[PDB]
Design a protein around this ligand. Structure first.
Ligand SMILES: O=C(O)[C@H]1O[C@@H]2O[C@H]3[C@H](O)[C@@H](O)[C@@H](O[C@H]4[C@H](O)[C@@H](O)[C@@H](O[C@H]5[C@H](O)[C@@H](O)[C@@H](O[C@H]6[C@H](O)[C@@H](O)[C@@H](O[C@H]7[C@H](O)[C@@H](O)[C@@H](O[C@H]8[C@H](O)[C@@H](O)[C@@H](O[C@H]1[C@H](O)[C@H]2O)O[C@@H]8CO)O[C@@H]7CO)O[C@@H]6C(=O)O)O[C@@H]5CO)O[C@@H]4CO)O[C@@H]3CO
Ligand SMILES: [Zn+2]
Ligand SMILES: [Zn+2]
Ligand SMILES: [Zn+2]
Lengths: 274, 274, 274, 274
C-alpha cells in the first residue's frame, strides 16, 4: 500500500525543508520544524509503524498535549538531505495519555534523537492552541540573513522594529498587525529559552531570536513559510536603503491608520503611537 | 481529445509564473497577471467548459470589454502552486455582451474567485486598447525588489525618475522611451487607486506604486516579461552605483538625443531637458 | 540518422545560453553567440540542409573568412528560448568564396536574421586568427552586471581599469595577461563601433564598453565562458569592497612580477607601470 | 555487477561538487576534492580497474599515508561537467608500499592527472590524521566569494579573524572553536605553499589563503561542506552590516565565555583575550 513518505503530511515537510535551504536560511543543521497532526491522519498508515516505540522522559509535562501525534526534524540532520533520505531525518512522536513523556513511533533511525529545540517547541505549541482556539499547528525557526543583520544595527525593541518593518512594505501591516517579538540574547539548548519564547507567544506571532533567527506560528505549513517570507522580503528592502544613504520619504502615520480600517485589522497601539 | 490544459495559452502562463517565482518578486500570493484571448483560440475545447457558469457582476460598467474572453489567476493563490495544479489556480472568464458581468467557463474550481485587484486590471486593459489599437494584451504587477527601494531615495517626480533610469543602462531609452509615471501612495484594493493607475497608463507603459510595486503592459506574454526584467536590471545597477559612494561620469544629454535619433524613438521632453 | 540538432556543436550551444540565463547577464534579448566550424563537421548532416539557401550580402569584404561555416544566434530571440526551439533561434551559414556574402543553409526559420552585431562579430574573428595562428574560434558578448556598474565610478582608460582587475583575485593575471580595452562611449549597432572593437581585439582578448557590456573570445566554449566568468567574479569583489570604505591593502607591484615569472606570462607594460 | 559510477563514494563526489557550482564558488577550474577510502571500499570494483597503472613519483616521501587509496579530481577540470561525466573528471589513486609515488587505477582518461595541488593535499592529509587519530577523511578547497573580500579589509590574523567570525553567528564558535588559519600571500602550485598550509593544520581545521580562497578538512563530506559554509554565512552577515555603517551590538565576551562550557567546548584562548 502507499508508502508513508508519499502522504500529504510528509510531502509538506519535504517542500518547506527544501525551499528554505535554497534561500540560504538553513546553513548546516540550523532550522527545525514541528507540525501538529491529527489521529485520523495516521490511522490508515499503521502498517509502517515500528514494533518498539522508544520512551524518552519529557522534562515537564504538558497535559494539553496528551495523546497528540507530531512530526519533527532529527537533531543534527540536514534540511537539503531530507529529500534524499526522509526516514533517517524525520520522525513521528506521540505523547502518552498522562503527558509526562513521548513515544517515538516512526523514523529517527540509527538511534537518532529528536531535535534539541523540542522543549521550546512543545511549551510554545500549547500556548498558541488556547490563544487562537486551537488553530495554530506549526512553529518555525530558520537563519534568515537579512533579519539577523538588522539586529546588529537597530535596537532590539518591539516598538521600534514593528514600525520599521511596517514601513518597508504595504502588505506587512496586514500580515503581522500583532507585531514582532524580540528577546535579549540567551544561551540556547536549555529549558529557560522555552519559557521566554512560550511567554511571548501570547501577544505576538513572530518573535526574533537575537543573532540566531526567528520564530513563527501558523495553521498550515505553507502560510508559516509565507509568513516568515513576507517579513524577510521587507527585510531586504530595508537593508538596501540604509546602505544607500538613509530613508528619505515613507508612509505617514495617517496613511498607516487608513490601511488598518480598510482591511479590518487593529494595528498595535504601542508601535502606532511612535 | 487533447485537454485544454495542453494548449498553448495554458502552458504559456505556467512559464510566466514560475520564472517570476525564482526571481524573488512574488513571495506569498502578491502580484497578478492576466492575458487576453480570442474566441477562436478556445473554440474546440468546449469539453472542459463548466456546465453551469457562475455569474459575478462588475463593480463598474466596462463597455469596451463586452463579449471578450480572458484568462486570470485566483485570489489568495500562490504563483508557485500553479504548475502543480493548472485547473485549481487559473481560470478563463468571458464578459457578457453588456459589460456588467462575466461567466466562469473553465478552471477556478472549489469556489475560487479572481484576484481582488480585478478592477485595476480591467480598467487598464480597456484604456491600453485605445493607445495601442489592440496590440497590447497583457497587464502585469509584481513587487520588483530594486524598484521598490528606489522610491525611498529618489523624488517621486516623472522628470527626475525617468532620467535616472535612462542613465543606468544604454538600452533603457529604447525599451521604454515614454518614461515611467509615478502615483501618490494609496490604500490598495479600493476603486480610487484604479482610476489613478489607469490615468497614468495613457502616457506611460510603466507605472510605479510607491512602496508597493510596479505595473507594466506588453504585446505578448514574453515581451511584458522582458519589459519588467529590463527595468529591474537598470535599477539594480543604479543601486550598487549609488551605494558605492556616488556617480562621477555619465551619458551626456548630447549622447542621449543621438542614441534616440538612431533608433527612431522620441524621448520625453520634460525629463530630457533636465 | 540523428537530425542535426543532435550534433556536438548544437548541444554545446544550448549549454552556453542556458547557463548564462541563470547567471543573469541576458535579460530580454541581450547577448550574442557565434561559433566557427569546419566543412568536415557538417558533412554527414547534408539531408537537413534547406533547399533554398538565402543569400545576404556582407557590409564590407572579408577575404580571410572565405569558405568558412558558422553557427549563429538569430536576432530578436530570447536566450531562455534557445533550449526550447533550436531551429527557430539558431542556424548555420557559410561565407562565400569571395568574401562578400553568406548563404543561410539551415535554421533562422520564418524570415529570421542573424544578430545585428554580426559586423562586430565577423571583424573581430578576422583580427584574432592573425594574432593566434588559427586557434580562437568563439566570440561571446554579455552584459556582465558587476562590470557595468564599474564604468560609472572608474576612469575610462585602458591602464587603470586593467590594473584594478588584476588585484581582484590571483588567477585574474594568469588568465588575461594582456589586459582589457575600454572604448569611449559610442552608439551601438553601427560599423563605426565595430572597427574600434576590432582594433582593440589585436592586443587583448577582453573588451569593455562603458555603461553597456563586455566582449570576449577564446578557443572553445568552455574556455570562452571561463574567461568571462573569471572576469566578472573579480568585479564582484571590488564593488562589494568599494562600498565598505575603499581598498586598504592589496597586492604590491613587485608581487605580480614574481607571479608572472612563475607561470611564464608577460604582463602588459602600460598597466604594470602604474 | 553494479557500475563504479553508482558507488557511494562516487555519488558523494557528484553531490559535493554540484552543490559548489550552484553556490557560485568554483568559477572556471577552481576547486578540488580528495577523500580517503579503504581497500574494502574498492574491493568490489576490481573489474573496472585499469590493466596498466601508470606510476607517477611523489615529490616527497609520505610514509604515514602508505597503502592508503584516495579519490581525486583532475587538474584543469570544470566543476560544472563533473556530473556530466564523472569518469573523465574524477580518478582513483593508491600509494605504493614505500610511499614514494602513486598508481592510477580508474578514471583520469586521456592522459589526465590529479589536481595540481596534490602535494598540498598529502602534506596536510598526513598531519590531520595525527592530530585527530585518523578521523579526518576529506580535504576541500573552493573560492567562496564573500570570504575573500573580508581579507581585503580586515587584518590578516588568525585570532582577529576568528574573533569576528564568532560574533557573526551563535553556531560558529561551537563548529570551529579551534579558529581558522591565515597565511601570507604566496605563489600556488609549489611545495613551499604545501609546507606552510600543512604546518598550520596542526592547530586549526581551516586555513584562509589571502585573495585566493579557503582550505577545508573534516571527518566526512557532509560535515566538510558545512564546515566552511558556516563561515560563509557569517561573512554574508558581516558583509551586510559593514556596508550599513558598522556593527552596533553583538555577542559580548561575557556572553561567549559561558556559551562554550554549556556545550563543554574548549575555545581558542588567543581570541578570547581580545
Ligand atoms: O589596388 C586595389 O585595391 C585597387 O585599388 C584601387 O581601387 C580603389 C577604387 O578605384 C575606389 O573607387 C575605391 O573602391 C571602392 C568602390 O568604388 C566601391 O564601390 C566599393 O567596392 C565594392 C564593389 O562595388 C563591389 O562590387 C565589391 O567588389 C567586388 C567585385 O565586384 C568583384 O568582382 C571582386 O573584385 C575582383 C576584381 O573583379 C578583380 O579584377 C581583381 O581586382 C583587381 C583589379 O582588377 C585591379 O585593377 C586592382 O584594383 C585596384 C583598382 O584598380 C584601384 O583603382 O587590384 C584588384 C585586386 O587584385 O580582384 C578583385 C577581388 O577578387 O571582388 C570585389 C570585392 O573584393 O568583393 O565589393 C567592393 C567592396 O565593398 O568599395 C571600394 C573600396 O572602398 O577604393 C579602391 C581602393 O583604393
Ligand atoms: Zn501589490
Ligand atoms: Zn549589448
Ligand atoms: Zn584556489
Amino acid at each position: 500500500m502507499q508508502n508513508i513518505t508519499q502522504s500529504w503530511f510528509v510531502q509538506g515537510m519535504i517542500k518547506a525543508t527544501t525551499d528554505a535551504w535554497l534561500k540560504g536560511w538553513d546553513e548546516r543543521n540550523g532550522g527545525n520544524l514541528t507540525l501538529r497532526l491529527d489521529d485520523a491522519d495516521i490511522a490508515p498508515y499503521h502498517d509502517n509503524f515500528h514494533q518498539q516505540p522508544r520512551y524518552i522522559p519529557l522534562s515537564q509535562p504538558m497535559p494539553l498535549l496528551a495523546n497528540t501525534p507530531f512530526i519533527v526534524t532529527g537533531s543534527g540532520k540536514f534540511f537539503r538531505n531530507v529529500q534524499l533520505d526522509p526516514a533517517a531525518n524525520l520522525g513521528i512522536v506521540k505523547v502518552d495519555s498522562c503527558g509526562a513523556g513521548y513515544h517515538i513511533l516512526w523514523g529517527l533511525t540509527n538511534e537518532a534523537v529528536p531535535t534539541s529545540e523540542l522543549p521550546a517547541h512543545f511549551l510554545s505549541h500549547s500556548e498558541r492552541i488556547k490563544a487562537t482556539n486551537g488553530k495554530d499547528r506549526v512553529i518555525m525557526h530558520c537563519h534568515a540573513t537579512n533579519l539577523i543583520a538588522l539586529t546588529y544595527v537597530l535596537e532590539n525593541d518591539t516598538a521600534v522594529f514593528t514600525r520599521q518593518l511596517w514601513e518597508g512594505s504595504t502588505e506587512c501591516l496586514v500580515v503581522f498587525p500583532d507585531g514582532v517579538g524580540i528577546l535579549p540574547w540567551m544561551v540556547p539548548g536549555t529549558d529557560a529559552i522555552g519559557q521566554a519564547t512560550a511567554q511571548e507567544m501570547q501577544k505576538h506571532s513572530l518573535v526574533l531570536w537575537p543573532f540566531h533567527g526567528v520564530f513563527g506560528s501558523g495553521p498550515t505549513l505553507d502560510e508559516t513559510f509565507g509568513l516568515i517570507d513576507t517579513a524577510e522580503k521587507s527585510a531586504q528592502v530595508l537593508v538596501k536603503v540604509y546602505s544607500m544613504g538613509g530613508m528619505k520619504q515613507t508612509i505617514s502615520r495617517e496613511e498607516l491608520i487608513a490601511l488598518g480600517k480598510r482591511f479590518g485589522v487593529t494595528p498595535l497601539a504601542s508601535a502606532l503611537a511612535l
